[PDB]
mmCIF file of C-alpha atoms and ligand atoms in Angstrom:
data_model
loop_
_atom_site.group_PDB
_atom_site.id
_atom_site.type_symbol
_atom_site.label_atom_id
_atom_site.label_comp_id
_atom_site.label_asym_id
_atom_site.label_seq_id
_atom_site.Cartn_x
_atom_site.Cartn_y
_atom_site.Cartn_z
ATOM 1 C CA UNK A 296 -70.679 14.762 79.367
ATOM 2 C CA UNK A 297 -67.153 13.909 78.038
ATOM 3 C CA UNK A 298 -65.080 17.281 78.794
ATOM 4 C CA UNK A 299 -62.417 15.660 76.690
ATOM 5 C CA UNK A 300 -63.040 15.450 72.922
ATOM 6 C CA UNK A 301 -62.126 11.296 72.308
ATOM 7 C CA UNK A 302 -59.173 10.352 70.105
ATOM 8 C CA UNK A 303 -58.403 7.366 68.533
ATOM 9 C CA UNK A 304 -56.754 4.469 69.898
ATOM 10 C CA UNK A 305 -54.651 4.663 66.528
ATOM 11 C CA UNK A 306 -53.445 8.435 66.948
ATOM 12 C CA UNK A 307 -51.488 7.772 69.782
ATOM 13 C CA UNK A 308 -47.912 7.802 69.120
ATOM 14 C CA UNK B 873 -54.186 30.538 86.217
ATOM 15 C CA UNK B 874 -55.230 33.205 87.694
ATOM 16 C CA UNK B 875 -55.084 36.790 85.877
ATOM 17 C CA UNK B 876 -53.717 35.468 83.240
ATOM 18 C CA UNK B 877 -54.530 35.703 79.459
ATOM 19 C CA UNK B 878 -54.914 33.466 76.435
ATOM 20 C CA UNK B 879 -51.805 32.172 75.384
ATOM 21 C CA UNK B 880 -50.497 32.329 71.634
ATOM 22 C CA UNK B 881 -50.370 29.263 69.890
ATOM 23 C CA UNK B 882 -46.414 28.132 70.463
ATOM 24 C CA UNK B 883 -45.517 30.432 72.988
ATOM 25 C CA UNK B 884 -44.734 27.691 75.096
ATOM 26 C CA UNK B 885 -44.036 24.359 73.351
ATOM 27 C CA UNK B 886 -42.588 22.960 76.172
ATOM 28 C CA UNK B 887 -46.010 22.784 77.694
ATOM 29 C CA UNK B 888 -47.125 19.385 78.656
ATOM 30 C CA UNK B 889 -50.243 17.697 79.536
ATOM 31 C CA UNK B 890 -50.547 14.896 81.867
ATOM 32 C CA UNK B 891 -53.772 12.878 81.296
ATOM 33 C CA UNK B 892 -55.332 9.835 83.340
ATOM 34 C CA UNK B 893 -56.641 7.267 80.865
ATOM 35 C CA UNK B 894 -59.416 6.321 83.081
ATOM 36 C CA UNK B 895 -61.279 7.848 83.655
ATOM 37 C CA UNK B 896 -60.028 10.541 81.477
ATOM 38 C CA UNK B 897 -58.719 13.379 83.775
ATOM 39 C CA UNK B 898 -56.570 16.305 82.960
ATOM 40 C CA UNK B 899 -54.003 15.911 86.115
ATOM 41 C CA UNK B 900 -51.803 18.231 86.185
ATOM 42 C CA UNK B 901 -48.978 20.400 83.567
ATOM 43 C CA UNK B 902 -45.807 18.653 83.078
ATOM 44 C CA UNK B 903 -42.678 20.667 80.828
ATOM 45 C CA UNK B 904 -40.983 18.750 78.077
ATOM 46 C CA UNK B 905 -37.058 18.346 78.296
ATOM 47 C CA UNK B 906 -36.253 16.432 75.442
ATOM 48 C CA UNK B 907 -37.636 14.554 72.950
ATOM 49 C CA UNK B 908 -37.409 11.249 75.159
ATOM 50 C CA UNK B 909 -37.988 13.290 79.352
ATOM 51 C CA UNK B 910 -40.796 15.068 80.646
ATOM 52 C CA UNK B 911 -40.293 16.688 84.032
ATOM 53 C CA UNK B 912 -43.520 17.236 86.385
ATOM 54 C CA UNK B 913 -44.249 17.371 89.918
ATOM 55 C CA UNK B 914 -44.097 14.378 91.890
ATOM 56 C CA UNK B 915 -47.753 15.062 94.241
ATOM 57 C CA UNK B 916 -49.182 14.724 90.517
ATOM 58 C CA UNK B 917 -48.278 10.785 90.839
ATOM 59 C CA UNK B 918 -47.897 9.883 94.290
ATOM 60 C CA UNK B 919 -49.751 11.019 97.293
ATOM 61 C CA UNK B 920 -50.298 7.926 100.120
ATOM 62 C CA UNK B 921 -53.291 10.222 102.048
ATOM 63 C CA UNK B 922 -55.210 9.813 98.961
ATOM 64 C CA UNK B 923 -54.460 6.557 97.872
ATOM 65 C CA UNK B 924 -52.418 8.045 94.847
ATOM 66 C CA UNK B 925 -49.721 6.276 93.186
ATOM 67 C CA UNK B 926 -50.170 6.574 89.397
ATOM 68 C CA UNK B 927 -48.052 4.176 87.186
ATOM 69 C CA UNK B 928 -46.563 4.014 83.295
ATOM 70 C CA UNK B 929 -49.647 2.502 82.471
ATOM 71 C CA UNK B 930 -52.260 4.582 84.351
ATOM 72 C CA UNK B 931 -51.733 7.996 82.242
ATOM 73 C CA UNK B 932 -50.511 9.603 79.286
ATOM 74 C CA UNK B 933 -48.738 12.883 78.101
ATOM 75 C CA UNK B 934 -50.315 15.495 75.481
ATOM 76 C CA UNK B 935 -47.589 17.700 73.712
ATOM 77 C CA UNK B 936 -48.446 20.612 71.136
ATOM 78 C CA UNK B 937 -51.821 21.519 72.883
ATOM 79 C CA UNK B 938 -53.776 24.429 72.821
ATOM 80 C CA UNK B 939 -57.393 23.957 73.623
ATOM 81 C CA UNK B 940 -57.838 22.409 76.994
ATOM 82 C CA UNK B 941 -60.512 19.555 76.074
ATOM 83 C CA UNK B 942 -60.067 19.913 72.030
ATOM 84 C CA UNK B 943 -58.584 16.558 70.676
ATOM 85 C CA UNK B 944 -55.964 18.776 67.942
ATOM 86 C CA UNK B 945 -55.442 16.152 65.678
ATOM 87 C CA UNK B 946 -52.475 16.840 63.291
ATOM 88 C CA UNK B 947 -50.709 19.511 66.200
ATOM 89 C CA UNK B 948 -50.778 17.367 69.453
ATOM 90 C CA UNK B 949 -49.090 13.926 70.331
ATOM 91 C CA UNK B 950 -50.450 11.806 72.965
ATOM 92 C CA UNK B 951 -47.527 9.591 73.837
ATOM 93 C CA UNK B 952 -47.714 6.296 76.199
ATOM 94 C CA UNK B 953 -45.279 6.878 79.441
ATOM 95 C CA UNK B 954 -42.225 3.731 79.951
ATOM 96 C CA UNK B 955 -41.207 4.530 82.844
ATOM 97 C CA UNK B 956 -42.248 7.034 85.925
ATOM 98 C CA UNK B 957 -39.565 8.370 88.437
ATOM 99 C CA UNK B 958 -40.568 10.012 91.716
ATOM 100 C CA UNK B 959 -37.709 11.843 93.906
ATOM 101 C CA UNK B 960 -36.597 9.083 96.593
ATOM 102 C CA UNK B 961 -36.929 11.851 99.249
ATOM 103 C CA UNK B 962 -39.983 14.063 98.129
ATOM 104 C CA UNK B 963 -41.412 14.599 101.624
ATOM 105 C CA UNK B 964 -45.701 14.330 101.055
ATOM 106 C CA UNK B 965 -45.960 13.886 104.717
ATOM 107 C CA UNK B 966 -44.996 17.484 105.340
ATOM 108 C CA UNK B 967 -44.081 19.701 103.539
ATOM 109 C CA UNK B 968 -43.897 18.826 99.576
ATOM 110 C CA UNK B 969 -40.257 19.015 99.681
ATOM 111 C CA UNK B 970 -38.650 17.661 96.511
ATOM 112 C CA UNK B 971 -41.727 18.146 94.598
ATOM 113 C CA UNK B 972 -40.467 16.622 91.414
ATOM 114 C CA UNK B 973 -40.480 13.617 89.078
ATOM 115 C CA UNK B 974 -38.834 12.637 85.433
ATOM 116 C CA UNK B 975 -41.558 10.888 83.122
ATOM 117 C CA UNK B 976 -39.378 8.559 80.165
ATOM 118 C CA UNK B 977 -41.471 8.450 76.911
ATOM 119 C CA UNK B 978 -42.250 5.051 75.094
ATOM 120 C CA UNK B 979 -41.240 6.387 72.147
ATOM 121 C CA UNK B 980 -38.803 9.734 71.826
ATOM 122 C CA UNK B 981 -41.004 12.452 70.113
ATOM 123 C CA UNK B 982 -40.557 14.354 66.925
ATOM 124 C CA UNK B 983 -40.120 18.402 67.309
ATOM 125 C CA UNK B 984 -42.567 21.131 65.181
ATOM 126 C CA UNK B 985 -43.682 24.412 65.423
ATOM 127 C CA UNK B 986 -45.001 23.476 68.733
ATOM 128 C CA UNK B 987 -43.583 21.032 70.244
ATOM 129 C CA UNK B 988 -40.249 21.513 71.757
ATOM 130 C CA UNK B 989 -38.081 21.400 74.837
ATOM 131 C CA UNK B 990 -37.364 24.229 77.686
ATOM 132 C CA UNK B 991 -33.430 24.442 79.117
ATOM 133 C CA UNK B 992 -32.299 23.592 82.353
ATOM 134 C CA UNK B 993 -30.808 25.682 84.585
ATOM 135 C CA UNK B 994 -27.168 26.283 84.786
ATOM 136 C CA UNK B 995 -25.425 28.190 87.976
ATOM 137 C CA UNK B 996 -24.758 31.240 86.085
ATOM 138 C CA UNK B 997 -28.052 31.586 85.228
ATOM 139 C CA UNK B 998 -29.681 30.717 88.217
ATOM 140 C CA UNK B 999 -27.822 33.152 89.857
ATOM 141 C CA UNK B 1000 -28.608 36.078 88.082
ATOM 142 C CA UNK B 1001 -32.208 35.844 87.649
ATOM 143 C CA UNK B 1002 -33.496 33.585 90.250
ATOM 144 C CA UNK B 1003 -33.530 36.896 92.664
ATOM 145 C CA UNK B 1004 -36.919 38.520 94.553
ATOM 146 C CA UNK B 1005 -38.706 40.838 92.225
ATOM 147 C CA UNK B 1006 -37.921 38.697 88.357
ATOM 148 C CA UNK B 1007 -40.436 37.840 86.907
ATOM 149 C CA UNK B 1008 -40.939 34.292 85.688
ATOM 150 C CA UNK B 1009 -44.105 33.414 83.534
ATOM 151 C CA UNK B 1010 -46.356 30.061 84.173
ATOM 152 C CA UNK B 1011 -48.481 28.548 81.932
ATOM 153 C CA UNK B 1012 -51.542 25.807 82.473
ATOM 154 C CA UNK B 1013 -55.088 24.880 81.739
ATOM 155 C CA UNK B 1014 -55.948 24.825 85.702
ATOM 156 C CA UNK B 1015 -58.706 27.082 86.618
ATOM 157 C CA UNK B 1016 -59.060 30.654 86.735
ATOM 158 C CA UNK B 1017 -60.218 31.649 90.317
ATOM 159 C CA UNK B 1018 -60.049 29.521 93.551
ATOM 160 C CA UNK B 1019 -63.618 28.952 93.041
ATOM 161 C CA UNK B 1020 -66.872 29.308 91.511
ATOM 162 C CA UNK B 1021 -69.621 31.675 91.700
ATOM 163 C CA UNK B 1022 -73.133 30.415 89.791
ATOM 164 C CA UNK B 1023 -71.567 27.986 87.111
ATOM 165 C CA UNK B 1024 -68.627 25.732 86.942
ATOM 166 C CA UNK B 1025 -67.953 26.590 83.673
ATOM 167 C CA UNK B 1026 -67.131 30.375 84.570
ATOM 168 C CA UNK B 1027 -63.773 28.911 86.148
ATOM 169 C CA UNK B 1028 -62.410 26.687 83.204
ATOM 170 C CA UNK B 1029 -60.297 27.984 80.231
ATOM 171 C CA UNK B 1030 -61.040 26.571 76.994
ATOM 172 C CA UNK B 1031 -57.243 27.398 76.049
ATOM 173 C CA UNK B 1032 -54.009 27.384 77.748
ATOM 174 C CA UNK B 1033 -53.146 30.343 79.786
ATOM 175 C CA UNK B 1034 -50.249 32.370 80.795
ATOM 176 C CA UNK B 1035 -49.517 34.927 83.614
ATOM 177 C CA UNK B 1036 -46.166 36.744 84.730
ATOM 178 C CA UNK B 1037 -45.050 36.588 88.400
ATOM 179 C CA UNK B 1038 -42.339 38.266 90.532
ATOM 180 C CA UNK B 1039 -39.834 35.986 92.881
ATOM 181 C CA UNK B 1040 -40.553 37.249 96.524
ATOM 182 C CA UNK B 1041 -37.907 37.554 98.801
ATOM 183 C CA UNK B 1042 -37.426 34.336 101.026
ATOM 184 C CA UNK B 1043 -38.440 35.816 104.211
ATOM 185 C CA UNK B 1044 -41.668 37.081 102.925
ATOM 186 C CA UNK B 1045 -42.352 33.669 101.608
ATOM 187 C CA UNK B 1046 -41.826 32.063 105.221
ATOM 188 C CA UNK B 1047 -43.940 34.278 107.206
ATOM 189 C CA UNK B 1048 -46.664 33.663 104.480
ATOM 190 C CA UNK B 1049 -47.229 30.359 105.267
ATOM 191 C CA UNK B 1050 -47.201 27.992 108.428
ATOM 192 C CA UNK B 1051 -45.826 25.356 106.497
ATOM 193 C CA UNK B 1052 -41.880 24.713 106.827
ATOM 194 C CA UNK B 1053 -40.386 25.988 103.544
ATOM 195 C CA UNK B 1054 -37.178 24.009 102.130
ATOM 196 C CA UNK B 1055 -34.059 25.572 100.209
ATOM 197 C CA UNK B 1056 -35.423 23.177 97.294
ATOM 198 C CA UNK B 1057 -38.453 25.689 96.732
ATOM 199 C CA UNK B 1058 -39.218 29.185 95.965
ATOM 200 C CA UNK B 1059 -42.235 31.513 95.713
ATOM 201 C CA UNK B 1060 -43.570 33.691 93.285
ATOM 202 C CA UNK B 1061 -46.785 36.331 93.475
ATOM 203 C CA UNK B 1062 -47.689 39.876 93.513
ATOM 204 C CA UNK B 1063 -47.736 41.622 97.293
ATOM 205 C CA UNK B 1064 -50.408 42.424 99.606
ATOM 206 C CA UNK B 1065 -51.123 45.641 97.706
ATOM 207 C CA UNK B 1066 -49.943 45.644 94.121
ATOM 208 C CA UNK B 1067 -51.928 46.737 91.257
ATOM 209 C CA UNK B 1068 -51.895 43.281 89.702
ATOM 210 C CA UNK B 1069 -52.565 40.257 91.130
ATOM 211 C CA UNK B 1070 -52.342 36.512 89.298
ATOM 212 C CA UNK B 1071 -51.216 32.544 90.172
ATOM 213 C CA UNK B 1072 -51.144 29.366 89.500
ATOM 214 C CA UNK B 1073 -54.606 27.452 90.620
ATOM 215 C CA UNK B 1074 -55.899 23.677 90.599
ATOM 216 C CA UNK B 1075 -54.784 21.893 87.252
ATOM 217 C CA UNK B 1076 -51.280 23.979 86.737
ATOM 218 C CA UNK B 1077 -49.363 22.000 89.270
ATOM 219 C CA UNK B 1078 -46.174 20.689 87.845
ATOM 220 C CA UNK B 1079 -46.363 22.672 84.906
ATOM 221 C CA UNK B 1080 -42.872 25.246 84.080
ATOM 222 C CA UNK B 1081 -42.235 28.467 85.577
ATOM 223 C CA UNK B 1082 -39.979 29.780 83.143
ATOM 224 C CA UNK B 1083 -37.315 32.597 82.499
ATOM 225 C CA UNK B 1084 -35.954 33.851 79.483
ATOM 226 C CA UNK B 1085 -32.325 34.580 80.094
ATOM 227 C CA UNK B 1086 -30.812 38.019 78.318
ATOM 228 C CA UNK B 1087 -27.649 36.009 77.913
ATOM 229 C CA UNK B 1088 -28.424 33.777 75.326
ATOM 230 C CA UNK B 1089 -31.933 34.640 74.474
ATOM 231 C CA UNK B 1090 -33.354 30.909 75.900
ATOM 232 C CA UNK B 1091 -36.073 30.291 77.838
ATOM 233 C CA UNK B 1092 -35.214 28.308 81.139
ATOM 234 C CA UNK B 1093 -37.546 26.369 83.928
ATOM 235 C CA UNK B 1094 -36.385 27.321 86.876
ATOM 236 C CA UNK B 1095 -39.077 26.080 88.560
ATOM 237 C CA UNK B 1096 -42.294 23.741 88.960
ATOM 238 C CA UNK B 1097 -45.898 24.554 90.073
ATOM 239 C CA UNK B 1098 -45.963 22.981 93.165
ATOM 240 C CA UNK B 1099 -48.083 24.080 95.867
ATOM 241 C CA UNK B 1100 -50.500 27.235 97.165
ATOM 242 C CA UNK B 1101 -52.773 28.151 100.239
ATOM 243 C CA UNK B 1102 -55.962 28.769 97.460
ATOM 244 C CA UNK B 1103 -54.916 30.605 94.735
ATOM 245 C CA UNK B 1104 -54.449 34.075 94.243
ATOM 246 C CA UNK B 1105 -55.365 35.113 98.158
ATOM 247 C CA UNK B 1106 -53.530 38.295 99.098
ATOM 248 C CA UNK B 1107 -51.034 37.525 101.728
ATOM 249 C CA UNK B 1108 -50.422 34.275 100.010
ATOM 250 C CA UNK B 1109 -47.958 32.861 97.536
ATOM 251 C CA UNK B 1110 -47.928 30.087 94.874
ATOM 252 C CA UNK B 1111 -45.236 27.866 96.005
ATOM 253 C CA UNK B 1112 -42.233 26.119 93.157
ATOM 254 C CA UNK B 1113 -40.119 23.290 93.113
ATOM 255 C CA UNK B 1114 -36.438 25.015 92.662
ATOM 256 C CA UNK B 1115 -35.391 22.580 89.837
ATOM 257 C CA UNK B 1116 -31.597 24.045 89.951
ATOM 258 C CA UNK B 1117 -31.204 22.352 93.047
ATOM 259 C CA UNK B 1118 -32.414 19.086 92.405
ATOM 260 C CA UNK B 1119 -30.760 18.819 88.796
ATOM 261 C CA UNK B 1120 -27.762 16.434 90.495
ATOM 262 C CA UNK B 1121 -30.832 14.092 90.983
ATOM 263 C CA UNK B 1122 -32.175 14.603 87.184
ATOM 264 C CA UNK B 1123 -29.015 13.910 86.022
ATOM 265 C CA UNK B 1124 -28.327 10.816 88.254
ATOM 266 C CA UNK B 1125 -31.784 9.145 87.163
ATOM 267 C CA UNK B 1126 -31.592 10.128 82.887
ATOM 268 C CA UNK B 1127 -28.277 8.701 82.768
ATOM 269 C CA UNK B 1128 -29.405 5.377 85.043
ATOM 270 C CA UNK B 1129 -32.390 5.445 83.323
ATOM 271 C CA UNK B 1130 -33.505 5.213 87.153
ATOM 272 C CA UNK C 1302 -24.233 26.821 74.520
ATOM 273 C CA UNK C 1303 -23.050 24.047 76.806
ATOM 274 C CA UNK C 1304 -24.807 20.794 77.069
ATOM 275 C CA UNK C 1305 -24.518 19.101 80.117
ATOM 276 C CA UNK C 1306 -26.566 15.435 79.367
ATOM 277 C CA UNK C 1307 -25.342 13.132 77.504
ATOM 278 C CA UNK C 1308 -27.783 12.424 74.146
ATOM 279 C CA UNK C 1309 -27.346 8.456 74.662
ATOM 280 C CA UNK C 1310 -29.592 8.716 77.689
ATOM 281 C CA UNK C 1311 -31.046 11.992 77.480
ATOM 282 C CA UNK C 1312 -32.379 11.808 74.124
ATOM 283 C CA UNK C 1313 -31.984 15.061 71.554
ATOM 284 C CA UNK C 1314 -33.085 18.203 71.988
ATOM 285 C CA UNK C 1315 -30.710 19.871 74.427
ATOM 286 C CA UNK C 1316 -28.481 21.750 72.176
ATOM 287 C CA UNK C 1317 -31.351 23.526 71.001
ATOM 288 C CA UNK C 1318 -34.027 23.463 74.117
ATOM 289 C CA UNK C 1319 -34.941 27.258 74.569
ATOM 290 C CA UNK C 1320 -35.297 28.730 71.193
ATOM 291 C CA UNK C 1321 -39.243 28.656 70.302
ATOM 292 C CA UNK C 1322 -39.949 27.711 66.450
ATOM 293 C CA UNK C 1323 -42.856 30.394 66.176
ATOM 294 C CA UNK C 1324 -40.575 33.423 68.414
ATOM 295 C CA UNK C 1325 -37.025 33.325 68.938
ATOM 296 C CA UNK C 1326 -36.327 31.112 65.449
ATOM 297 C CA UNK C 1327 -38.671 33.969 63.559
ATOM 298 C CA UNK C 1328 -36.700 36.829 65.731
ATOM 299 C CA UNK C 1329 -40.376 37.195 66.401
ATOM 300 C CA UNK C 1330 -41.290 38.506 70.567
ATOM 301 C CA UNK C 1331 -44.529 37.389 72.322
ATOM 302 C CA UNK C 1332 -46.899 40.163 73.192
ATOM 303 C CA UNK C 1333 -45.698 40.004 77.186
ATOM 304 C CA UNK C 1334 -41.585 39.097 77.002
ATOM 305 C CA UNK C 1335 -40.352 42.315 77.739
ATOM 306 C CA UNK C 1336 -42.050 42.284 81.004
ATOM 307 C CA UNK C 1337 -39.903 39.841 82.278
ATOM 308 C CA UNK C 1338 -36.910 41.531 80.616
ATOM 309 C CA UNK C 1339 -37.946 44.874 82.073
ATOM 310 C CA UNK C 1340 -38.206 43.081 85.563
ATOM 311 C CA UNK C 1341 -34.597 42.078 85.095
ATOM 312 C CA UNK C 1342 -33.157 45.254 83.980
ATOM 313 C CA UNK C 1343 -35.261 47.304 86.641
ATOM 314 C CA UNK C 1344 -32.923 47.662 88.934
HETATM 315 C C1 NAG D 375 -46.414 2.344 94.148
HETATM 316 O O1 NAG D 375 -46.719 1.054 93.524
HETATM 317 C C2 NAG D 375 -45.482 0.377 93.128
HETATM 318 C C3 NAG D 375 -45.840 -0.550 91.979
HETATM 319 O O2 NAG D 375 -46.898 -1.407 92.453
HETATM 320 C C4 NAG D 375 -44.822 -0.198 94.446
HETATM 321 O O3 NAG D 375 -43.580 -0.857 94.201
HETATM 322 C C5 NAG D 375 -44.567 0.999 95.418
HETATM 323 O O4 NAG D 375 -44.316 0.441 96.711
HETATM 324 C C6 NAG D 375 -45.792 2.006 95.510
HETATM 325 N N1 NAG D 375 -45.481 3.324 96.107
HETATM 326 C C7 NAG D 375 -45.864 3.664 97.365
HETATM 327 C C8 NAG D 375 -44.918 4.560 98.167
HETATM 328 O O5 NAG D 375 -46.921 3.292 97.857
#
């Protein structure tokens, strides 16, 4: 159950 | 952490997570030096007993966080890791010694609000604060008792948390513990019988234990969450890597790049 | 304050590392500094 919310591949610096 | 309370949003900027890409995995708290170093422990990327030897490629660093599991769009950066240096002589086998290692960002990253880097120890400061009874304040996301009682849940924060802990005198420390302790480490906790109690726990390894020096109104790392017998046992104290000491070494591997 | 890396290698930040954006740069304290201070003076 994902405890991390996902971020985009294209957020990361 | 253990005892501890919510933390205000920027009260440590410095703070750094260290995240495994896969599968995703907060690992451990890591301190931000500069805009290009991040300084953590080094049993949070290599441990031979367990198999563990995380490279660049296996994890990533979160700067600017609050929330432990929120992605904060906008306020964090999740940066991609060039290069990963362990201390040449951390000792696993025994004792931790040397618990320390420098993580190079791929790209150097841009300061806010909250995002930006803790000092270094000097001698001078070190010296007149690193002495049994200062306090020093840690912050993490690790869990807030040793264990659980009915639900998981009851143990994780949902935002970073800080706690204030005295230095104990070296001797104290040693009879604490069977394990040999090193000059290169110090220990921090409330005694057998205080009113207040409060530690580090599981997750806030390698994160900063930090001073703010009277001098010049900074706030310094003198140390790294590095090791505890459970956490927040009477009798027992949470165990840091004294990064004075091994600063020679930082130096010697930022300006070789390793 | 004295730096004591050298920016080529170490990147920026150094000259400034301590000093929080939201606290010392507002001459704003955190609800639990003077603990620590008290701790020092204590003594
Ligand atoms: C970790 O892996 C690297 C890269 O594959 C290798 O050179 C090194 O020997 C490994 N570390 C240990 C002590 O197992």
């Amino acid at each position: 159950q994902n405890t991390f919310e996902e971020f985009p591949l294209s957020d990361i610096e | 952490i253990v005892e501890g309370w919510d933390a205000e949003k920027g009260i440590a900027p410095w703070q750094v997570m260290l995240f495994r890409k896969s599968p995703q995995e907060l690992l451990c708290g890591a301190s931000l030096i500069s805009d290009r170093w991040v300084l953590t422990a080094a049993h949070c990327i290599l441990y031979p007993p367990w198999d563990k030897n995380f490279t660049e490629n296996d994890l990533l660093v979160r700067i600017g966080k609050h929330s432990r599991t929120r992605y904060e769009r906008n306020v964090e950066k999740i940066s991609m890791l060039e290069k990963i240096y362990v201390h040449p002589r951390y000792n696993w086998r025994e004792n931790l010694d040397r618990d320390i290692a420098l993580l190079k960002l791929k790209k150097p990253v841009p300061f806010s609000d909250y995002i930006h880097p803790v000092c270094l120890p000097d001698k001078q400061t070190v010296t007149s604060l690193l002495r049994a009874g200062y306090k020093g304040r840690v912050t993490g996301w690790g869990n807030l008792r040793e264990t659980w009682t009915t639900n998981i849940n009851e143990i994780q924060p949902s935002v970073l948390q800080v706690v204030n802990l005295p230095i104990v005198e070296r001797p104290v420390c040693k009879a604490s513990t069977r394990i040999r302790i090193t000059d290169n480490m110090f220990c921090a906790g409330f005694k057998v019988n205080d009113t207040k109690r409060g530690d580090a726990c599981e997750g806030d390894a390698g994160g900063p234990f930090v001073m703010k020096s009277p001098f010049n109104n900074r706030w310094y790392q003198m140390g790294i969450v590095s090791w505890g017998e459970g956490c927040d046992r009477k009798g027992k104290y949470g165990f840091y890597t004294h990064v004075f000491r091994l600063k020679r070494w930082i130096q010697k591997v930022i300006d070789q790049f390793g | 304050f004295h730096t004591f890396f050298n920016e080529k290698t170490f990147g920026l930040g150094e000259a400034d590392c301590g000093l929080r954006p939201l606290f010392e740069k507002k001459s704003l304290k955190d609800t639990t500094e003077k603990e620590l201070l008290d701790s020092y003076i204590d003594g």
